[PDB]
């Protein structure tokens, strides 16, 4: 069957693992549990196509930039995640986007900008900010909450459909 | 607030009204009740943006082609719906797509191809068929069921995001 190699990137603590586990294992992880590198494989049907989601859940931090080049090379689609209560993670988006373009030799990689934790009342990043950035990148913006599961399938399936029209 | 003028088009009986009512009024209509022209207005929040969905639910049939030019002129985004157990409705898609391009003076209008009734076991249109068409049109393909509500918000929000990157 068709297999989609999806990579989840973002600053440490934005909810990269929480999004993925919510998709795969249908529960919200509210535990401190930092990632090095986890792979998830799952058979799904998306718009009637049977396919495998091969998800690479990555680490945020300079520790990883080595592991990073390698895993971005083989990713077909990238979830670029920031947290809506973390302005620094929002500004860090540019850095991940540039490393991806570098390793992919591409101005246009299938990519979704994900504003996570949208359930929290204390936003420091306005949706309009993130939406303007997304439009300047030429990619969709999707807000998510791993906590309530709002936007979680949306973000992943939208990325799979981006890879399909690439 | 931002307002998105969305038009739902398709052959008669594909589930145009069922999709819209499911979105708006959270119930599946299993009654014979043909449409001439219904408008739905609803305040939503999509990816943190407060906006109004202004939905034009249209009639299928040559009766309407007059009413059709007029309403396609002002639509910003179009849901092009066929039913997965109706090959004729699938072939009719081309005709709607061409009339839209004609009235819009545009090779590229925000548009999603929607394969409806995906809950029915008796498919006569393979997902792969519809997916190839979607890629040749350069638009997303989304399968839906107004009955189970699978893919309904997906189809509408995806169209709103298409209008946003247009
Ligand atoms: N309320 C809220 N908190 C969330 C959400 N998603 C993640 N969190 C919380 O943020 C913290 C970090 O989540 P985690 O999924 O581990 O993030 P990470 O980005 O993968 C962390 P690391 O980069 O080290 O791998 C956890 O306490 C988690 O419960 C969300 O949408 N809502
Ligand atoms: N099982 C199933 N039947 C559906 C689905 N959506 C629509 N139907 C059924 O198809 C029939 C037509 O639905 P309707 O929403 O009225 O279609 P329409 O395309 O708007 C018809 P008209 O063009 O005349 O306005 C109804 O009996 C409805 O219950 C669906 O996803 N699943
Ligand atoms: Mn993690
Ligand atoms: Mn109708």
Swiss-Prot record, chains A, B:
Transmembrane annotation, as ranges: none
Q: What SUPFAM superfamilies does the record point to?
A: P-loop containing nucleoside triphosphate hydrolases
Q: What is the effect of changing residue 89 to C?
A: Found in a patient with severe fetal hydrops and pleural effusion; uncertain significance; decreased activation of Ras protein signal transduction
What EC identifiers does the entry list?
A: 3.6.5.2
The keyword Lipid biosynthesis is annotated on this UniProt entry? no
SMART domains from the entry?
RAB, RAS, RHO
NCBIfam families assigned? small_GTP
Name of protein:
GTPase HRas
Biological source species: Homo sapiens (Human)
């Amino acid at each position: 069957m068709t297999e989609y190699k999806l990579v989840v990137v973002g600053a440490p603590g934005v909810g990269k693992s929480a999004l993925t586990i919510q998709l795969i294992q249908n529960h919200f992880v509210d535990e401190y549990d930092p990632t090095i590198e986890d792979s998830y494989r799952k058979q799904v049907v998306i718009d009637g196509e049977t396919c495998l989601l091969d998800i690479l859940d990555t680490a945020g931090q300079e520790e990883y930039s080595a592991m990073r080049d390698q895993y971005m090379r083989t990713g077909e689609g990238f979830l670029c995640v920031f947290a809506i209560n973390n302005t620094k993670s929002f500004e860090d988006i540019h850095q991940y986007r540039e490393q991806i373009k570098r390793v992919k030799d591409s101005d246009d990689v299938p990519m979704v900008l994900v504003g996570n934790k949208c359930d929290l009342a204390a936003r420091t990043v306005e949706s309009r900010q993130a939406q303007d950035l997304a439009r300047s990148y030429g990619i969709p913006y999707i807000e998510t909450s791993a906590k309530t599961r709002q936007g979680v399938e949306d973000a992943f399936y939208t990325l799979v459909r981006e890879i399909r029209q690439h």
